[PDB]
Amino acid sequence: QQIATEIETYIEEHQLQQGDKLPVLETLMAQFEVSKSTITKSLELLEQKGAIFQVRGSGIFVRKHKRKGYISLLSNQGDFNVTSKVIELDVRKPTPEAAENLNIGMDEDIYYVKRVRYINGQTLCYEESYYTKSIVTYLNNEIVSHSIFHYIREGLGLKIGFSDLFLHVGQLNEEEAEYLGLEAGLPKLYIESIFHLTNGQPFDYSKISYNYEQSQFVVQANS
Amino acid sequence: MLKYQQIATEIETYIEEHQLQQGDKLPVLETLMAQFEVSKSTITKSLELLEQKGAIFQVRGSGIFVRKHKRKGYISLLSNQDLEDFNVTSKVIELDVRKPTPEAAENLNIGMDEDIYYVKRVRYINGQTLCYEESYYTKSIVTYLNNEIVSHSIFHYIREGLGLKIGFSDLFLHVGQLNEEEAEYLGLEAGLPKLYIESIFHLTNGQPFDYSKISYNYEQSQFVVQAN
């Protein structure tokens, strides 16, 4: 897993391109000082991730699309200078919609965050999210000004598992358009996201409206 | 195509029939064995298939659970891992052999003097417009296309008829306003919102074969993606 990171660094270090061939299996086990079945698992991840593709009896090959300026849709698939203005942050009972998406009871406290995110000083998105408080046990203004996932991973030491994203296209409303510095009625990508711990428990339900002028996304699929 | 494939399919059916949602626990290993009267090893192989199919997930210590996303009526953004099995029909506007645009040549990784098949089509889900598409196929790979193939599933012919093995793809997503030509094909007004996706599909050897440009009807489409 940290080997995958070194490999990925090595790929960046050598400015390798899509399709160019990585050293053979045995060179990598000695290049990183690890077992066979270990390195193949480290490769299984990179492939799931879209870092490599493999073809039995040809080799293992770097995978890299050639476009710039795209935000990876899926958190764990990828300098965007991104900052946040926190609008609201509190502890609250969930709405029926938040309770259904987090799989919780109406009596269970959540953290609620409303924030505007910024890319290179322009508006990126307007975001409302709901966190199950028995999982995400503490939040404050500074935590929530930055990467909340990093705090959850590094700070709380939680293991982030799978997620589902539901993507809709529509027209900005007054408050979204106000928050984003755009006119009502203009287009938006609107995403509802549910993030899970590796145990399967949801912990984050997120509703996000993006600035159509300042965002564009890449997602990768495997074979 | 083996016993582990049949068991996988019956397990999916069980999920559907019992209307199980994400997080619901499936029968334990020994129950499945007893059920399909098979080995522990046969069940273990059925479980891997399903898991890589995003049908289930497993948490050691406590069990096997349904993975499939909640909510209904979302098109799977990533192909084959919804579209073609919705009731989707196509009107072919153009199909011919053509030199590629510079853009298509670059996305297909070809010289500009290499022939492509060009397709322009409006697609429909239950009598309503789904999308307006232009796609470009490297002709030395997709060697023949006709009206019939292109009004149905092109990937179906590619796999089944040409015997090609479809591998990874990259999708680039943009949100924009419909222009007059898109609005007219979609039956919507110009200036209204669209999701605009460019896709590059590759063979398993990494060679591109299909570059497509698609604008969807914002009133008739919404997408899901499962990330692991």
C-beta atoms of A212 and B175 within 8 A: yes
Give SS3 for B218.
Answer: coil
Q: What does residue A135 show for φ and ψ, rounded to 5 degrees?
A: -115, -60
For residues A13 and A96, state if they share a domain. no
What distance in Å separates the CA atoms of residue A76 and residue A209, rounded to the nearest whole number?
A: 20
Q: Name chain B contacts of A197, Cβ cutoff 8 Å.
A: none
Q: What is the CA radius of gyration of chain A?
A: 20
At a CB cut-off of 8 Å and minimum separation 6, what does B4 contact?
A: B42, B45, B46, B49
For residues B136 and B52, state if they share a domain. no
B54 φ/ψ sector (left φ>0, alpha ψ -120 to 50, else beta): left
Give SS3 for A162.
Answer: strand
Nearest Cα residue to A191 out of A219, A158, A160 = A219
Task: Note which residues in 103-132 of chain A have CB less than 8 A from chain B.
Answer: 103
Contact B131, B221 (CB under 8 A): yes
What distance in Å separates the CA atoms of residue B226 and residue A95, rounded to the nearest whole number?
A: 24
For residues B211 and B223, state if they share a domain. yes
Domain CATH number, residue B31: 1.10.10.10
For residues B77 and B9, state if they share a domain. no
Residue with tokens 């890589």: B52
For residues B54 and B92, state if they share a domain. no
Nearest Cα residue to B27 out of B41, B43, B49, B6 = B43
Picking from B36, B70, B104, the residue at the C-terminal end of a domain is B70
What distance in Å separates the CA atoms of residue A103 and residue A203, rounded to the nearest whole number?
A: 9
For residues B105 and B199, state if they share a domain. yes
Picking from A41, A66, A91, the residue at the C-terminal end of a domain is A66
Q: Dihedral sign, CA of B76, B81, B87, B88?
A: positive
* Chain A nearest CA to B104, separation (Å): 14
What distance in Å separates the CA atoms of residue B170 and residue A66, rounded to the nearest whole number?
A: 10
* Chain A nearest CA to B94, separation (Å): 28
Interface residue of B169, B178, B189, B225 to substitute, partner A, most A CBs within 10 Å:
B225
For residues A47 and A101, state if they share a domain. no
Residue with tokens 């199950």: A132
C-beta atoms of B218 and A170 within 8 A: yes
C-beta atoms of B59 and A198 within 8 A: yes
| Chain A residue with the nearest C-alpha to that of B198 | A218
- Segments forming the whole domain that contains residue B6: 2-70
Angle (nearest 5°) at CA B15 between A207 and A132? 30
Contact B26, B64 (CB under 8 A): yes
Contact B201, A56 (CB under 8 A): no
Q: How far is CA A19 from CA A55, A61, A63, A64, B210, in A?
A: 11, 5, 6, 8, 17
Amino acid at A134: S
Contact A124, A82 (CB under 8 A): yes
Query: Beta strand pairing status for B208-216 and A82-92?
Result: unpaired
Count of the separate structural domains present in chain B: 2
Q: Name chain B contacts of A19, Cβ cutoff 8 Å.
A: 206
For residues B183 and B104, state if they share a domain. yes
Q: How far is CA B124 from CA B6, B133, B150, B180, in A?
A: 33, 11, 13, 19
Which method was used?
A: X-ray
- For A74, the token pair is 């899926």
For residues B22 and B54, state if they share a domain. yes
* Chain A nearest CA to B178, separation (Å): 10
B26 φ/ψ sector (left φ>0, alpha ψ -120 to 50, else beta): beta
Q: What does residue A222 show for φ and ψ, rounded to 5 degrees?
A: -100, 175
C-beta atoms of B173 and A210 within 8 A: no
By CB atoms closer than 10 A (0-12, 13-18, 19+), residue A189 is: buried
Q: Name the strand (E) or helix (H) holding A142.
A: helix A141-144
Angle (nearest 5°) at CA B162 between B79 and B104? 60
What distance in Å separates the CA atoms of residue B203 and residue B20, rounded to the nearest whole number?
A: 35
What distance in Å separates the CA atoms of residue B171 and residue B152, rounded to the nearest whole number?
A: 21
Domain CATH number, residue A112: 3.40.1410.10
Task: Note which residues in 18-77 of chain A have CB less than 8 A from chain B.
Answer: 18-19, 48, 50, 53, 55, 58, 61, 63, 65, 67, 70, 73-77
For residues A61 and A80, state if they share a domain. no
Picking from A13, A36, A66, the residue at the C-terminal end of a domain is A66
Q: Does B159 touch chain A if contact means CB atoms closer than 8 Å?
A: no
- Up-side HSE of residue B43: CA atoms within 13 Å toward CB? 16
- Up-side HSE of residue A129: CA atoms within 13 Å toward CB? 26
B74: DSSP letter: -
Nearest Cα residue to B219 out of B93, B79, B73 = B73
For residues A107 and A61, state if they share a domain. no
Contact B119, B153 (CB under 8 A): no
What distance in Å separates the CA atoms of residue A70 and residue A43, rounded to the nearest whole number?
A: 24
Give SS3 for B133.
Answer: strand
C-beta atoms of B172 and A61 within 8 A: no
Buried/exposed code over A78-110 (b: 16+ C-beta within 10 A; e: otherwise): eeeeeebeeeebeeeebeeebbebbbbeeeeeb
Query: Beta strand pairing status for B75-76 and B223-227?
Result: parallel
For residues A109 and A32, state if they share a domain. no
- For B56, the token pair is 């289930």
